[PDB]
Design a protein around this ligand. Structure first.
Ligand SMILES: Cc1ccc(COP(=O)(O)O)c(/C=N/[C@@H](CC(=O)O)C(=O)O)c1O
Ligand SMILES: Cc1ccc(COP(=O)(O)O)c(/C=N/[C@@H](CC(=O)O)C(=O)O)c1O
Ligand SMILES: [Cl-]
Ligand SMILES: [Cl-]
Lengths: 396, 396
């Protein structure tokens, strides 16, 4: 049965973990997968998470299955983060949320729900985007088409190209938008641009799917949701796949949410019964631990205050690392102007290193980035900054 | 986009939770979903699990992503439970295991792996079986066909009918076998029958997929795996989807495993790279908490001893409840011979109640079973036994 199966290529992002682990050299520097590291180059459990976990250990009295859509309080806290307290979507009961195993899980649930229950055949994704978007949608049987997004010469959102790419999208196609911290470019629409896209997609009949994996890492929780809220105000229907992996440092507990929005509560409840059927046929019901930590934190004033300050701390450290990286490249002799990096949002720097420069950085210098040239700025520290920049300068 | 979506039917098993929750009557009795309850009608966290969780709280220093296939020690402990310490499959490195979100997740991963990477088009499932089997395989695009299994008149495995149903299976079809505690019938092949099926499926070219959600609930961990081991000894290739939800009481943490076996290590490693690609496109990587609890327990002599005795305790309580149920039906005037129930394996009693009797038990008596007539014996207690049996007698 299996004699003839050809090997899959290693994953361009997660596959780096294997190579990095196998590299026995001591000065290695990991700027690959999008995890946060603190000033010591560690990814600790957040203190608010440990506190919540201690509370759960003391107070949980069963592991009985959650509902297919997960913890109700988790869904309500998620909708409030996405749409804002007092949102009409919430008041009108127009949104249903399933807790999912990670943002990836939420994208797969959305895709299977769309493929089985609507006329959707194609999803439009930005070029460039996270490489696993294509894989997830294709796995559900949906075609993926790309829309232009990035002007590499000026390091800006090429809004005219984006518009004119999307003119090929038909009514009823899905268009995927990253909510904030575009991966990999770090370049987000301004609010006015978000508003322009909202009106365009209503006019053109696109179904918006927002990916929201980095809420809080661009400017802050509420500001980062402004683009999604501009869409929510204009559309009867949309879907949001959101993750708490990064903003709670809960990567391996798989905590995400798929939120379905429709014109009214009768419609969303009917549609949502098919999303639950899709989940049941996939992983049955979602893992409680990480979601219960998030719900415990978000629903407790003290834990929430601790957590929101930890999120602010991560965002500000990454911003300090952006400045230091730009400053140190200059000092180590780069010559090129890299100041555009300071303006990028989120964990990454997309600096125009070629695939061969990235390969050379790994093989010769033990510095690990993704082949697209995406670098995890959140993996930089004052101690590894000098060697990292010396290596980059050496490959330029 | 969603105006026209027709509502999904509620799930025949998980949907009971909603109805039971909404039923405001005080004497309700829950014999529906397959969770264990102790003598107080509660589903507590196992003591070995709490201990492991305390250890994790004290010792975990990151939530950084696991590999796509999860915790290595978890995979190794899983293969040892399935195949036995010293198994040739293990020595020859012929098996790869991915940790998955539950047994359901492992079945979906197997199905997507098969659909995308082999010529498999059809999976054969016993009539009756767990209703979500059909849903999972169909969601991956595979057809499901049924094979005869149960002689309801004599309450036995109708082995001749099973054989003659399966003559219609082609070489290269998958045949799904429940490892032990067949759900819903509680009727398992004897070892000699397992051995006969192993030789038959090799001869006929069927790919065996074992579902193993109840290891330890029939007779014990090792005895319950004898059928799978009879298959492993005869086949070059098979897949096992196994769950730790029930035998660790970890239902909501979603702890399962998909184990792929091929003729040699080169083949299984190549095949497994495509199973990992399928996982990446689904939920990316699996939830650490429940799996890390299982690995922590299975890899520690003291915790393992505690856990194995807790598993024995659950199995023996269910066996005491089977006897008490049969005895009490007799005392409350059933008249029918129900002694066949004592011999059934696992959590359930499949007693021949009709769908209408089950509906009447819910509506009129607040007693909740599944429409197929499956009753969760693990939900019976000395205190709820009298009322439960009075209700059943009243509907006969
Ligand atoms: C745009 C986007 C959407 C969805 C995900 C996955 O989040 P999850 O862990 O499933 O909650 C990521 C995260 N990307 C990371 C890590 C990875 O590739 O798995 C990265 O790009 O390095 C992402 O960047
Ligand atoms: C044969 C079989 C295979 C797979 C599963 C799901 O296990 P998981 O929770 O995903 O690890 C169950 C469990 N069945 C239960 C609970 C349910 O239906 O979800 C039941 O039949 O009541 C099962 O009975
Ligand atoms: Cl509902
Ligand atoms: Cl490997």
């Amino acid at each position: 049965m299996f004699e003839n199966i050809t090997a899959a290529p290693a994953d361009p992002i997660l596959g780096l973990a294997d190579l990095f682990r196998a590299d026995e050299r001591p000065g290695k520097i990991n700027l690959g997968i999008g995890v946060y590291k603190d000033e010591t180059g560690k990814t600790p459990v957040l203190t608010s998470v440990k506190k919540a976990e201690q509370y759960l250990l003391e107070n949980e009295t069963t592991k009985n299955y959650l509902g297919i859509d997960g913890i109700p309080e988790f869904g309500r806290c998620t909708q409030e983060l996405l749409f804002g307290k007092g949102s009409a979507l919430i008041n009108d009961k127009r949104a249903r949320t399933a807790q999912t195993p990670g943002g990836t899980g939420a994208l797969r649930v959305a895709a299977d729900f769309l493929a089985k229950n609507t006329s959707v055949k194609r999803v439009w994704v930005s070029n460039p985007s996270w490489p696993n978007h294509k894989s997830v949608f294709n796995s559900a049987g949906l075609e993926v088409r790309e829309y232009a997004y990035y002007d590499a010469e000026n390091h800006t959102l090429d809004f005219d190209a984006l518009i004119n790419s999307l003119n090929e999208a038909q009514a009823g196609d899905v268009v995927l938008f990253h909510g904030c911290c575009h991966n990999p470019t770090g370049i987000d629409p301004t609010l006015e641009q978000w508003q322009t896209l909202a009106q365009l997609s209503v006019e053109k009949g696109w179904l918006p799917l927002f990916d929201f994996a980095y809420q809080g890492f661009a400017r802050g929780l509420e500001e980062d949701a402004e683009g999604l809220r501009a869409f929510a105000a204009m559309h009867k229907e949309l879907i949001v796949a959101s993750s708490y992996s990064k903003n709670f440092g809960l990567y391996n507990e798989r905590v995400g949410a798929c939120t379905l929005v429709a014109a009214d509560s009768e419609t969303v409840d009917r549609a949502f019964s098919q999303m639950k059927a899709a989940i049941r046929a996939n992983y049955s019901n979602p893992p409680a631990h990480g979601a219960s930590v998030v719900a415990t934190i978000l629903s407790n004033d003290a834990l929430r205050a601790i957590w929101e300050q930890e999120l602010t701390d991560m965002r500000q450290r990454i911003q300090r690392m952006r400045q230091l990286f730009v400053n140190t490249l200059q000092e180590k002799g780069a010559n090129r102007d890299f100041s555009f990096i300071i303006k990028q949002n989120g964990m990454f720097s997309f600096s125009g290193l070629t695939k061969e420069q990235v390969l050379r950085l790994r093989e010769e210098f033990g510095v690990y980035a993704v082949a697209s040239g995406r670098v995890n700025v959140a993996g930089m520290t004052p101690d590894n900054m000098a060697p990292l920049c010396e290596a980059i300068v050496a490959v330029l």
